[PDB]
Subunit: 139 residues, 4 copies
């Protein structure tokens, strides 16, 4: 419904080769008509120095997810999307397991996209909430 | 002036072992009475899938830098600091070289710290601006 | 369910006397177990100079609504709540009618609250999305 | 220097007639080659119900100031500017006197502008910091 390109999880994951998403173990997990989901491990790759998930790593996940979502929503033969503004509240710390982000659209305009991204640890309790504004730019 | 613990760059860099900062090559570079500076490479470790610096990686740098700055400003025998809210505008893309962040204090309160963090590529032009709110929490 | 103090719309409205909410015609309209709703006129009181709803006025509505929601959730004999951080995306312009905001909780912690606030004009299309962080402060 | 149209404080003030800025007593006060300054009373017009400056009112001031700054920087025969994203940290409460905002440019791009807006009460201590993203839109 939301998507122009039907998401293919294998393809999404493969596109990350040689980029931070691959390095951090970000995995696109699921999608439906209204959302796209990706997860990331909470370990030494994503920890800050006191053994908690680094808040910036949560934002890497959010922006990876939202950027990919935007990519799937535009005519890629005429446009590309880059992040313009991002913000996040850090709600709960995580030490282990994985953190899962779900992206939903707030607004898909001609020049900007705004995504609502909700993160939670394996216990299912909200860990982070982010909002991401993407600029839509002519090729 | 700002600092409680005088920053020692060697020590800052070493504290990152086995955390994302180490993995991404974040390097604490300089400090003075009013600021703390760190840089990060722009390469396959920090790229998004189209060869640009991932916006989330800019935020990892900003939050690494600001969190460390907060750590240096509190009585660590009674308090620790965790990120509470972060936001950033993405101003210009970067493809190579390093991105350098400079953190300056907006407000150091008893329960929150607010940091102004300015990022730029090797050409010196502003690439990202972030603001980070840290919560100050009793041990 | 969310609430400690059961919302009473008359008191909420009456409490705005001699404050900006009264000046701008903010009206608390509705509530349920999970949300609180207020609306505001789009007119000369809330316009910017070009005849569109001022983006700051959208934020006054959001912050009025979320701050009141926080007040209804804390023990007011021991605590009061103040805005700590606010952010908003301006999605669509509005010229007339009313703008309606709905607040839902993202997280009610011991020291901070985070509210999701969605605004729309009379056509029902999203016009602004805000996120508000409140500090919970001992009297 | 920053400016395309040279700021004229009388016109800026006069232009607010029949809009929220006039209602709240926003006064454009000063400018130089790099900044624009406006102030606002802290009184019943701008209070929240507990007698503190409403955090949204701080944002009205910031967005009025930054939007006017954008208008003075674009070619107004081809473009107009609207708020796209705004965020603020509320640093200190204010009860009386005036709050003064100073706007400085972070980035004036072709399609977006980013403004740094610093607010303080009459004691000169930082009371709020805002960042505003404006969209540049063809007429």
């Amino acid at each position: 419904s939301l998507w122009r390109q039907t998401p293919d999880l294998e393809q999404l994951n493969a596109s990350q080769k040689n980029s931070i998403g691959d390095l951090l173990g970000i995995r696109f997990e699921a999608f439906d008509d209204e959302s796209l989901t990706a997860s990331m491990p909470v370990d030494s790759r994503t920890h800050q120095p006191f053994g908690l998930l680094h808040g910036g790593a949560s934002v890497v996940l959010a922006e990876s997810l939202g950027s990919m979502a935007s990519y799937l929503c535009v005519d890629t033969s005429q446009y590309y999307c880059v992040g313009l503004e991002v913000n996040a509240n850090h709600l709960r710390g995580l030490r282990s397991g994985r953190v899962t982000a779900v992206a939903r659209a707030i607004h898909l305009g001609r020049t900007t996209h705004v995504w609502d991204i909700r993160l939670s640890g394996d216990d299912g309790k909200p860990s982070c909430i982010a909002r991401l504004t993407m600029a839509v730019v002519p090729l």
